[PDB]
Design an enzyme around this catalytic site. Structure first.
Site, PDB file in Angstrom:
ATOM      1  N   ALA A  59     -28.242  -6.830  39.772  1.00 31.58           N
ATOM      2  CA  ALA A  59     -27.100  -5.938  39.892  1.00 31.58           C
ATOM      3  C   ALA A  59     -26.435  -5.969  41.235  1.00 31.58           C
ATOM      4  CB  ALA A  59     -27.522  -4.517  39.575  1.00 31.58           C
ATOM      5  N   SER A  60     -27.114  -5.466  42.245  1.00 31.49           N
ATOM      6  CA  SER A  60     -26.489  -5.364  43.547  1.00 31.49           C
ATOM      7  C   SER A  60     -26.906  -6.465  44.479  1.00 31.49           C
ATOM      8  CB  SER A  60     -26.759  -3.990  44.089  1.00 31.49           C
ATOM      9  OG  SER A  60     -26.662  -3.071  43.009  1.00 31.49           O
ATOM     10  N   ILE A  61     -27.664  -7.426  43.968  1.00 37.24           N
ATOM     11  CA  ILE A  61     -28.003  -8.595  44.763  1.00 37.24           C
ATOM     12  C   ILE A  61     -26.708  -9.399  44.809  1.00 37.24           C
ATOM     13  CG2 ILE A  61     -29.675 -10.463  45.073  1.00 37.24           C
ATOM     14  CD1 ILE A  61     -31.591  -9.095  43.378  1.00 37.24           C
TER      15      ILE A  61
END
Lengths: 394, 394, 394, 394
Positions: free
Chosen positions: B61-63
């Protein structure tokens, strides 16, 4: 030893077959000069329920350009052909061309790499220039029979050049018709006889030309999808006007043998130092290097990462940054025909000192895939299969 | 050589999997640039009984913020982007903001570290201020399709700023949507094409964007627990409005390769003195230092002991008292998505004179864990696995 | 005993699968009340490589109308429902309609046979009238969730009637939504509970409604071809607004059991005279005759040779000229859903005196075929399979 | 019961197959309305090794004229068509013709029996007159596609008449193209739709028109011998310009059904007196008599002993001298197509008082033979097979 790789490759073949909806597909894999896998999936003929087999004969289309290149290279080795001499020396029927009233020369070297001005199926210069800055074509569905290459030359011998020779890359098929005319003029014999002799030398016994009257065993059928998403037969066509560009019929074993011969001719020079008992290759080592040498200002449609050489698309090996993509060296050519799709890939193996001293050529993997479905790209699947067979080999 | 560490790490993975009740989990460990372990536990799809494998594709997701940061750093190296220039230079569609009638400037540097005033999912200023002194959100379950970043900007371009720019830390995802718009404006090409080119450069062949229509092989399913403590499917969502913030799909091998590339770019400068044959890193050594430099007045939610840098959370090394805790230097980023959880951790190795003179970069350990369970924190497990693999290495 | 027929039927299934390019297909054949063949070909899920099996759960679309008809027939047998009473008796929320200012009555009998004025997906009266003299629709791709049938009625309760009731045949799906509302009003319980009880009575344990949140094992995927002739996923849809029309999920065994129950209920009356030990059918013999009685001024789209009855298409038996086509009596219903196609066919066996005196019901063949491909007609293949299994039986 | 006859008939089939060197041959025999024998010998396709089977689809050529005659007879029974009216009433595009400046009338009756002046493939009047007192033709190898019968009329609508109408017999195929145009004008619908409806009525489900694009299962190949006495493929041809004359594809079962229907229609009138429960024939008894009535001044090429009727060749029964040849009554029609040969024969049985009182129609034998070899006469073999099956029947 290759059991793990075979299963995965079969899964990959199923993936592409279901993605494109191809009624049939045939594969062939050769490792280190020995054929280790050969299988077919689906039906070669859906009306009579004929299963696909390794003996199936399908339409290789532009892999033919490679055969013509082999013929041209052998003629050049014999000293009969000069690459830089203008083509009017051998074929005076081709008119000389002007480009806003300036003298331009068309040579064999330009014709081989498609750097020549000759057009493809489209005749409108404006659209080609706009694109540079289709199966919808009429010439692609011709049915006339042409007795000789000189007769076939009349389809495009009067059209003006689209670009300056050696200035713009434009893939073309009529350039190889001109190349076939040059071959049959310089060799002193008919083009088909010369290619038949070459096929006999390379043990390609099932490679013949597209003809309707003769009985050709294990000949398959070719299909396409209509507007209602229903499988139908492709229209009847005659390919006599382009023998060299796309008029041949073959199996996967013949392509494997051809690739093995090219790989041996490429790699024999490195192994010559250690062992003097190796038989010479079909072509001289310098000739093979030239054939696979990429040419600047050229494009490779089926892989943007590489360029074009002589009748082949070549991707080199390089690495720009550490811990980042490592390019692998290989050569490939794809073919698109009405009702058919094919690919031939050669993956050379990196050679070390111990391998050169101990092993013998050829060292690599050749993969051939043919399917009876129109407009299918098989380069990525062949590359994946070749890489996975490269992993298993020890 | 790593057999003792592998078993213990597997035990740790079982511990977390049973603690959270995750139907499946995948891990990937790389030591000194070589992948030494990769395993999956459970089922990627429980309806069709599909086991988890290293080839499973799940939602990082936020990688993704890290990938956008790599893109921004490359653009800044090329000289196209200036960090301190106001964002209205590149994106004039974003309105200028006032803070009790005083001029404030929003810049790329503030957007990267979340020091900007832009809000997160919550729209009520009073609650945010009270908290400063959730999957329950509506915007998190959108299904509309957004063609371009400029269209996506309309979700938050009219909301007032919550804090003064550069004054208060507030983690946000729309700031990276603005960053993606800035990237596609400054680079001259679409954001997705630029990221695809970057992924091709880094050999991340399985990293694609969240889409429903295309066929993506080995795509997993995502689950959550209801009020009756029963496993159910997560609702269908569309993530087109946040590509840069959290719209990508990947495997563990791609994350390992990305981490290895970053580690090499970080460590090549130290080894450059001894050996001049090392290939350059993907980014300049000064760029890498800036990326991993902690920024004051920032927080690291998944580890209170460290701070935030540029799209990364960095914990430094220090020791205050003798015979007391010795802090270890590492960088990490976690991701929380509907139905999914992930983490990427990099543990650099302390470099001495002999190691620099003899060994070659990269020197460290990268750990990636992904599970198809919502609201799972995996930072501690990754840290323990990395430390234990650090012990075994000799 | 059926080995010859099974092979030929498999060949027929391959024929249709290759003709339409369906990634998967499942078949089920029952002879004389016993299941004798069940097979699947292809992949239910092509992304995760899940093979098709008889346990696969796919979307039966309009075969649901038959289940609602069974519910309505049972309610009518119980005496709760009257066919000729206007629908405003049970559902007063439906407004009364006028036809150039004349009183018209909409009844259950007209709604069942589609003789009612209610429209289908198209809202333009002019085009419908021109056609009388599509997956391109918007309402077919809705995603809203509707809690109850009364809420679902709002989609079409304000549109004017297209034709006079009982005057023109127009296939419709909203009429069965009104029928479901009538059922749940007259029975005193919710429609889904009544259908669940009916399925439990008939031993259809895998028949559920289309829902996303609950975990349904062996649920398949649904595909379509795009403009580039490439297999893609179908868009996400919600079918809660039409449970009775096309909102159910089932296997081939459940359809076989349902067909066997209907055949037994149809044929028990003929065998009652010889043996008094036979258990009663699920519905009274007179009810079964009415259900399969063709209605005048009706059409059968999947077979122009027959007509329509009550939620079924019935082709009768007749012979007009000597040594000329002999019509065979059977009943069938086909279903078309986004990403799916299905068919259920019942072929009763001609009964003689000796067979009635000796054999026991049911006597016939039921065939069910489901495929995960959009817009596929399977009636002819089912008819051929049923006829060939009729030949083998002795 | 027919075992002795079957063996001898098979021997006769082998005799003709070896005499002409046909790669394949299929036979079908029906006795008293029931099919008692059906077999195939050889290969339908020699390239793919596909054996001949009763399901093989081959090119019936001029047996099509009989189908058009059935259509014309049904139209005449309906009262839409008048035989003696000039053809300009229905088709005004056909120019009026003169014969040394005298008015001549071309009617349907003359066109049916070939008594009309229209030519065949040859265009030179002098050679035709000399012959009266060939696969070498060009029009026989056309490949153009013709959308409608009116478009097809342009091939011969401007040629002058060869003989006076009703004066000289000249077999022709374009006359039946004109007949098809007349049929489609008088019936109000397209010719192909009318024939499809007729085939559906007679249960001929495998009878279709010669087309390349659609997929037709079990379609065979057609061969010829070259100058070197080697089997080769026949050239590709398009038969759209003559649907009625020679354009249909069929099996042996369809021909058997057609012959049985004609025999029943012929014989029902004799049996009507004894039993009133017999279903009516497809055509009225008077219509059938007219169809099989020989016409004076006509010839039967495949049997000089008989004459020609309406789209049929009829040999009557007679005996001139005692203890000398007793002629037998039968009807037949042969067909010659590029790459194919066929025959259909009907042998009525002599009816006595007891047989009429006891037995039911049809009473006779129908024989159909098709082979994929060019220029083969099969009338004598069919007659011998029919006679021998006539002997066995008791």
């Amino acid at each position: 030893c290759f059991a793990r790789a075979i299963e995965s490759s079969r899964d990959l073949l199923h993936r592409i077959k279901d993605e494109v909806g191809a009624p049939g597909i045939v594969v062939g894999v050769s490792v280190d000069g020995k054929e280790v896998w050969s299988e077919g999936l689906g039906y070669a003929d859906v009306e009579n329920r004929v299963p696909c087999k390794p003996e199936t004969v399908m339409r290789i289309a532009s892999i033919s350009k490679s055969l013509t290149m082999v013929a041209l290279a052998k003629l050049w080795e014999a000293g009969k052909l000069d690459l830089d001499i203008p083509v009017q020396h051998y074929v005076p029927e081709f008119p000389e061309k002007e480009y806003e009233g300036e003298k331009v020369s068309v040579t064999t070297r330009l014709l081989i790499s498609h750097l020549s001005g000759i057009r493809h199926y489209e005749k409108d210069i404006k659209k080609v220039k706009e694109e540079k800055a289709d199966f919808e074509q009429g010439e692609l569905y011709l049915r006339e029979k042409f007795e000789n290459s000189i007769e076939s030359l009349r389809l495009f011998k009067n059209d003006p050049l689209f670009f300056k020779p050696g200035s713009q890359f434009l893939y073309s098929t009529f350039g190889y018709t001109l190349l076939a005319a040059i071959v049959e003029r310089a060799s002193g014999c008919k083009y088909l006889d010369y290619m038949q002799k070459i096929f006999h030398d390379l043990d390609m016994l099932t490679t013949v030309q597209e003809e309707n009257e003769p009985v050709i065993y294990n000949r398959a059928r070719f299909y396409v999808y209509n507007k209602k998403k229903r499988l139908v037969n492709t229209p009847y066509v005659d390919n006599s006007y382009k023998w060299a560009g796309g008029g041949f019929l073959s199996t996967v074993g013949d392509l494997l043998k051809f690739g093995n011969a090219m790989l041996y001719g490429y790699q024999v020079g490195l192994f010559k130092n250690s062992n003097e008992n190796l038989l010479p290759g079909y072509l001289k080592p310098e000739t093979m290097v030239m054939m696979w040498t990429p040419v600047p200002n050229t494009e490779m449609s089926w892989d943007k990462e590489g360029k074009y050489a002589m009748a082949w698309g070549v991707v080199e090996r390089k690495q720009t940054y550490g811990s980042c993509r490592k390019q692998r060296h290989y050569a490939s050519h794809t073919g698109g025909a009405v009702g058919a799709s094919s690919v031939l890939l050669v993956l050379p193996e990196e050679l070390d000192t111990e391998t050169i001293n101990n092993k013998v050529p050829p060292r690599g993997i050749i993969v051939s895939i043919i399917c009876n479905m129109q407009s299918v790209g098989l380069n990525s699947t062949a590359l994946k299969i070749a890489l996975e067979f490269d992993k298993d080999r020890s």
